[PDB]
Amino acid sequence: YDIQAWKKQCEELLNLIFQCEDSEPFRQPVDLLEYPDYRDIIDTPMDFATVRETLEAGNYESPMELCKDVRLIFSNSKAYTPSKRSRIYSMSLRLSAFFEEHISSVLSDYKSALRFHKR
Template structure:
């Protein structure tokens, strides 16, 4: 059920910026601002590998994805809006 949810949220029309880790090329200062990065592909691996076994852990990592995006991207930006909508 957890994996099914992760797969379904990655199909949302605004999920594309969160599907893979942010690269240094895309955002050179990202790791200076976001100390605990998370994305849907990493989350899926954690679910498949058994590191996430309950809804609370899944929600925690989902919130991390969206909170990171809202921390890094200014309010009103597309990424901030996408993250706050998905959250």
């Protein structure tokens, strides 16, 4: 019932994601000169370095907020892809499956800890 445990669990998951070759296109903000129209399509850019820095700054209050930002990385990739068969979009689908598989227990444990605190 540790209410704070999610933070280190998210740091460890981000470390695994950074080790994944599939995270390469998502480690830093999208290159705006390589894709000059990016901001015409994407309203809120997001990347894993921004997520890690927000976490390390103490600017996430819960793992749900971190999860919303990570999911935004994947929805931005889906929105920008010209095809569902593209290389970068295909990498995002595998990385999303990996992330969802590992974040599920982090969210469940945090929500359970909060419920115990208010029992």
